[PDB]
Design a protein around this nucleic acid. Sequence first.
RNA 1: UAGCAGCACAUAAUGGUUUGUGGAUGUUGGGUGCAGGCCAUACUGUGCUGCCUCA
Length: 705
Amino acid sequence: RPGSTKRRQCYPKAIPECLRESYPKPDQPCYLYVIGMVLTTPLPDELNFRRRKLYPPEDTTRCFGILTAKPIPQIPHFPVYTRSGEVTISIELKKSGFTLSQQMLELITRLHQYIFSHILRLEKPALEFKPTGAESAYCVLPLNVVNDSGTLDIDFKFMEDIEKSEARIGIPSTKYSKETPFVFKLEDYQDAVIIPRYRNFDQPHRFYVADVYTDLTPLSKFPSPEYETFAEYYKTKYNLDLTNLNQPLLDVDHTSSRLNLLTPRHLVPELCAIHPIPASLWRKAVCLPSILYRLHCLLTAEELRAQTASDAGVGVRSLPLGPNPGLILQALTLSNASDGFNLERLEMLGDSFLKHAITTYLFCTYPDAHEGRLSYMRSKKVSNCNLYRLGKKKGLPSRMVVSIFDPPVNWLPPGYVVNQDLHTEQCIADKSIADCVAALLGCYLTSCGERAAQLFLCSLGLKVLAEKTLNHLISGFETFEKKINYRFKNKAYLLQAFTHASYHYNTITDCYQRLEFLGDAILDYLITKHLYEDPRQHSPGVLTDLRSALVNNTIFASLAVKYDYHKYFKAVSPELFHVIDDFVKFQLEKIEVPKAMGDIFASLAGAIYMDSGMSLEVVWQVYYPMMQPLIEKFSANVPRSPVRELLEMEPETAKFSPAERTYDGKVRVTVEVVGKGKFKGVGRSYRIAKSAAARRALRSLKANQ
RNA sequence: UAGCAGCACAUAAUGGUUUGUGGAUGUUGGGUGCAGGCCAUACUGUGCUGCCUCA
């Protein structure tokens, strides 16, 4: 069915408008952004398994910039988890409206290719570098501080120095002899990336210089147990005799192959070529895939924020408000993506508000439609099928984050195309598109409030926007008004709330059932909002359990008895009065629960809502003090089924019999607890019977402990 | 800068199970649809490893 988990569809991935076709043209105005990088949380030495020097990216004058033909909007700063620790990223406009020559742009584009293909090794046989034909068409370039002024600019000199360098295309062929011996220069290695010249010619392993040992030489002990000395190693493995046996040695670390950094995890110089790119900048280069991916994700979320501010009138189109893009990115992120956050909390809050908004809308729009009809219409509008259609129509599927980020497998680098797919497409379930709509509703509710959430629903396409007889029938309700600490402006709502359909003496209001319908959705929403806002910050699963336990007709009947509602209840059914009296007796001492007692509890919420001028707050002021002891009790001790509690205590030893239908239509169930006895329960249903059996067993087990 | 094999978690797939829920031929409740919680087979990713390439 449409809106089911069992139905899956493929969608193309959205690329933000500001990155699409964004290739700088010769002699045309362009934008230069700086990637600001600050080490905000250093990694503990215990997790730094080599105890290597942490490198704050900010300690170094060279960085990267983004060159684009289109402006990038402000996005929240975001963390990236490097081997140094948590680095906060800023994307800052440095220059706007400047021009580049064909030669300058070619130099940038060649270096940009060189980064993704040669440095990062993200060019694969399935990928082609076509910067003018690529959908995501921006260049990344080196920036440096000009003349120690602190001012960053395009380091054209460094790009040209890379182009003149023979070390760009492969390993330099410069062999040292006794006539031209190797001379070590310390300055050339302090921030170097090096390439060993004697091995792995197709895939030269690159290393950072981590340190320079001035106390160690080629005649010193080798790190592999296979060779005694560095000189012996190079002679034995590659037939290379060293010209300078007194040169210092380099302590080296591999260049990182891990390019997903969005979450926390928890040699002889003479035989090396210097790669023209410094190690500081190369450490920054390794972050580019995660940075550009995160940038892409946040830009997609901001595009959706700005679109919703246009379509719904909710927020401001450009910020100097609407939700933070990080919360939209949360509502777009499935738990499968593993990104440290997910939509599930926002979804549940959204669902509760959605019910309320539609219920209120239906109640007010259809003043003559009875409860069962409003309930039926409600059930169709809130369906996963309808919500999927709305989410598809809004173009959410292309914007969702579905899978775990993996640069070489599912990410297309800027200026590349796919040779005709995990790079360009994603497969999504119809239900997940429905769940995302509710999470977005929860995002707009939490950030912008209830009116803004209603306008958001309207933007999706959901339409969400006698007296003597009265005084006689309400006689004595002044004591009830005092008990609930609320006084009605219009006592007809109070009468309606306490009028059963059997109570034909009321000819001046309807029965309670319409106000019951309205009150049900109000109480669900208010309780859910309160549970979501709870300082304990309950998990998605626990929120579901608490919502289920608190939003219940049995609890509402129990409260209605505790707050004397049964004394004001207007009915003409002796049988209903007996069932109520038996339940009232059982509740006063601490058996069928009379539905009508929970229904009038909801109906009075509906009454107060209408009498207060649609004030949810006034309802909550009345109901919160009544419910608080239960909200505290269940939020302290998240509730359980007695059958589940028995199965948790006795998983292999507790076996339940089949349902035996007794002669009175009632179900009987036996639970056998191996070695501990057989306990029978009876009730009108298998669970009242199985729960009664499980409670008798649990009582016996707890008594024998 | 590589491959593989164990163990933790996330995750979709095919089966079952269980709570909720719906109009239904509804002879007095087993037909199907969508959600949660579990049990089983099987996939990927990250991580704790283990063996094993180059150094």
